[PDB]
Amino acid sequence: GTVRSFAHPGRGRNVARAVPKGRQVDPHAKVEIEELLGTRPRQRDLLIEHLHLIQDTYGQISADHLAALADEMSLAFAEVFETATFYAHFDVVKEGEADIPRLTIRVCDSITCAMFGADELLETLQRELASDAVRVVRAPCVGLCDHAPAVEVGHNFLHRADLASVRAAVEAEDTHAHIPTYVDYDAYRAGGGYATLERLRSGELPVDDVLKVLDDGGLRGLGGAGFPTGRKWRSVRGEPGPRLMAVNGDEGEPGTFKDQLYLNTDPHRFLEGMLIGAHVVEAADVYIYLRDEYPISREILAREIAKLPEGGTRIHLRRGAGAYICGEESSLIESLEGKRGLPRHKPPFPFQVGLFNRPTLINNIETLFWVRDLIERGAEWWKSHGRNGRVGLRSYSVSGRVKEPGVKLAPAGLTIQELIDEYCGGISDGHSFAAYLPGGASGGILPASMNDIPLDFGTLEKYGCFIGSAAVVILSDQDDVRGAALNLMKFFEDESCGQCTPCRSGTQKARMLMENGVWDTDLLGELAQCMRDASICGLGQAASNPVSTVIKYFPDLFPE
């Protein structure tokens, strides 16, 4: 009794809360995630791997499971949510939202596959096969440009896909990766493999002889930047230990597919060069960051790594979740630490402050692939190759309007005419050479009149271009040059990490300005200068190259 009550106006809102503020962890969800995790650690740097485990187990990441994961790892809700939503392959489903269909089909819509009708193919598959159990979505370049158009069914990538073959895969439940035959651990050792690494560990081959061969060899970074490898290995060594190593296998530049070829044919050649560099800089752990779109490579590496002897360096294999920006070395570091892939500011530089704020060595897959050959055959053998005054060997990923697309292992410094005619079989019939992209999406667009420029590190900077990862895309007369520029801008608009204004907003405004029929080339000129000068990282600094070069070198397309 004794109602007493209270004259305070809260009686209008007088419904209170049945639970504390915010969403609440479900006891049933906690048990399910705890068994799913098992004996795995709960450190922050395993967050993305744990997100993969939930998405693969259930086909989606429900808010119930996500909330349970945060409680397990002692993280806040916004911490796990902001991380998961960064990556394109994670589907977060909140309460009352539609579930993700069991099977997902992804149609590449990047530059090379679009030239072979990917836009119509995606429309057909959405009209034909999309249902309550099949979902059809666009995807950026999946490193299959020489087999365009490329479509992924589950984990199974289809070469030269069409309506009939894609429907065959769905009916046959052919949704898994097809592992090919490759050079395995025993065949590698029968060919003298790992002998060079053994000499290094014992001490018969001095570390100083490895660096001398690299510096005299002139090996340069094949990830695109071209920094000399021997000079980079020395710098990481100079810093106080402990030291770490990470391999960049996030091959995401549209038109680049060379790294996939070497992983799927001779994995142990890559693994030896990685282990040699790890010994030179005395790195205990090596992290391998492999892109999500390479399921065949992921399976091949997992088996071969398990075949290695009990060495002094532990190998960690990590898996991406779909982000082009994660190839940038500092953004790759943030992803390995379990966070959003946002590039860091410099200074300091990654070789001084990197993974877990330790001196870290980052190398591309192809750069480490050639380390064994450069030592066992000498620096003189490497420098014997080259044309037009340039020195070295290069692997050009060539696609487009050529008869024989693929990876060409050709001398550095060739011209596009020489590359097309001496290694690609020439322009395909019913087409005439019109334009080419020397460095993939970010390298600019050039007319066929400029077919006499050697393609090498540092030679394209005169014309506002760069070789990058040597992704060469060939265009013909039946290829809108301004349409190609809009495709690249749409790629950069989607792939921007969103950190800084010139890139996050500049790519959006540039895309909207290019979809009008008459480009305001003066306003686009001023915008391009701002993005080059003020963007934080390489993506924003190069996103305006396709617009800038098309305006400059194709004057006949823009009426006054």
């Binding site: 809102r13 006891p27 809700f77 204004t501």
Partner: protein, 913 residues
Amino acid sequence: TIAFEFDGQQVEAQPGETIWAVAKRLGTHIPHLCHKPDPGYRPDGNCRACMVEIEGERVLAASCKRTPAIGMKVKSATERATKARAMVLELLVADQPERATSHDPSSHFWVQADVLDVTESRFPAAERWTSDVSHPAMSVNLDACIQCNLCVRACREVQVNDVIGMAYRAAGSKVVFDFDDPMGGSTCVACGECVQACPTGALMPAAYLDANQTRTVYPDREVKSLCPYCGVGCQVSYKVKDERIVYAEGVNGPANQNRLCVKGRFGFDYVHHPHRLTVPLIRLENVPKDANDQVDPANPWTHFREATWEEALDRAAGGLKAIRDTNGRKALAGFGSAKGSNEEAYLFQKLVRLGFGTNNVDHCTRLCHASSVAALMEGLNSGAVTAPFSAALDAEVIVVIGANPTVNHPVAATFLKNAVKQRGAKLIIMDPRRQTLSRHAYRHLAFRPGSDVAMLNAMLNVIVTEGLYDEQYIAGYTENFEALREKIVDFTPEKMASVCGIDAETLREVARLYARAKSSLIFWGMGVSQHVHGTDNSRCLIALALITGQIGRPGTGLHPLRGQNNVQGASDAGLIPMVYPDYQSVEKDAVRELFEEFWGQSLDPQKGLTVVEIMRAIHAGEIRGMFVEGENPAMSDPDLNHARHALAMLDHLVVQDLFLTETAFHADVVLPASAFAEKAGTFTNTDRRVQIAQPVVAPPGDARQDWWIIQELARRLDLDWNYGGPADIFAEMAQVMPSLNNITWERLEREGAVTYPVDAPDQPGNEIIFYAGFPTESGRAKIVPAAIVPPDEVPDDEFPMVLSTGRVLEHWHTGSMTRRAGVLDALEPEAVAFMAPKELYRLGLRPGGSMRLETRRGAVVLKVRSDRDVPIGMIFMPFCYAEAAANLLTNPALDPLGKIPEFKFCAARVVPA
């Protein structure tokens, strides 16, 4: 210093200084959006509006982010840099809503755009997210967001409330709460830090916008004052429009550094509530007094009639004087306020001791930290904290026991979280309940309620036996350690693990971690002190600090948190029965004669009664008249049935309050006083910081200043007082308070805050004390061993549940102020109690359902909230709800020494309702 060249001039830069800071110090202002030059905000360098040109670099550099180096050459006026900054601003302007009708047309963004002559964009607009007005205090309109991340930094690194994140990618990057949930239904605690940080108006106080999310209300003036609620002592800037406070912002005070909590930022509204008393009231000479009496504050004419100030003052003083001159001087008592100023407390205790002629003066400190104070005086001969809460940043190990600082001292808790996040401090929480802070704790010990002594004695046993103590400190600065070494034998972790519920390995690990650290700091609160054995718990904590030497150095010491905004200052002014001002004992002849010469009147030499003793004496008919100012014992006293009986038994009760509170129901005369925001005076915070308050607005109607009312009562009690105002009172107090040496009203006005004790009028005060010994007779602290004592009332088959009482974030004590503040009322509208979900399942209840709570002393009915932080076998309930008053059930049994009731433990039964 790092000397370099800036814009063609030779300059020198201090270490750890950015190019933007150098240019600003030298007068050259560079535009900035994502950089906020205020403490705690690390530059991020993402908006790119501050770009400068550095010679020998390919691209431009962010001046707010880069520090200069020897030989560098920086240029900011070049066409490249100016063009880039202008283009960044133009890109941002493209997406902004139209300025004249925007959410803040005078935002920092628009001022920066004005400086750069950018008013329109050549770039097309994009349609962004919609408005979110789910939270009653703040409004979210992300169509004006520029993605600067200042709110993310505010929530995650400054406050570390961990609510906001930046979720998606590219131009779709979006500020989100939790899983992109509405703000009103998220984990947001409404501290408002993000609102203060945001430069665009995307986040605003809801009171500034109309129904269309435009046209920020524009205050006429801003006044700098303090927060009226808790002992942290935040400095606040009140925004006033049409003589009404509409909003409040944080100020760079030494305690808070621009940070606030929800009560400080949004809880100012109670001063304008329609229930504010405006005229004196006199009880009608027809209505009897009853314990179950009820008066409607909106309509008090059922029991009262309004009176002139002269008539009401005459009635109050005449009743008191008649009781004094007929029944004797010991038949009177007074309850002062810990929420008033130091000057008002001094005048109140002077009034009691001279007009009433007795030492029966006390306040809520008797219910707060009496046992802790008793233990500390027995040990160190002092009751003060030995370090401020900001010393947590220098502490390797931080211990929080029996305190819930993220609810009851939130700004100090933000500094603790800063220590954990940025300095690697290891936090150990000892509390039967898990808390929001527990996720950051290195260890959370969740021992059984009432068993502090067992766990602390096990830790002391581990330290003593394994030889982890500081022998050098013990031999030289303490005494009586041999007694402890002898006593502690029977308190091994193996025996005590079952008693405390914490495994022996955890106890050993925590003891080693505390003893071996370079610096350890202990905080404790009501969970330790509010038991019949609270003095034992405090003795254990003091022994832990003494034997390991973790006291008297930076990052070390003992900090029992001060609850009310001015409990420390009221205690210093002598508003307690056993001492004169500055803790001078009323029993010593020398002190009594000094004060008899100072005040010119003989004084009673016997010690007074405490709050609970006073209530007992009222219930027995020994005390006849009472004067109460700024206290609500009809809700805050234990065992409210008998307490209200005692209050209704009085011959004459005078109440000086802001509203017709539950205590004022039984009053004979009610005198309307002025709130904190209407007065001037000095207030002392938990860190011994004396700070000055300023009047923001005027009192409503005919309400008067508290000091003026006390002066009127004294004058009618045959005392010749003539004080101009608080400053004169301060001078008189400083004449007899040596702790105020070198602190004056002028210095306080000029600086705003001074820490005592201080040795010069130009030097800062001593934050750390006891570095050279203790103010004992021999200069050494005495170790007093403790023994296990059971709670007064323990559960049985009749009453099987353990009942504990405490506080919630949005409400204050009895609810007299916070339930009259609109935002706080909206956040917590109904009376609720907390219980573990498994207990709800076992008892047959559902979340949000009603239940009947019963002890041997009373019964209530209220709603139930399911909470996984509450242990099995416990029910937790705040005492701020008049419809279900928690103190109707509590045990009035007292600690034998501290004389504090056992609010934190009693036996209850729960049934569905």
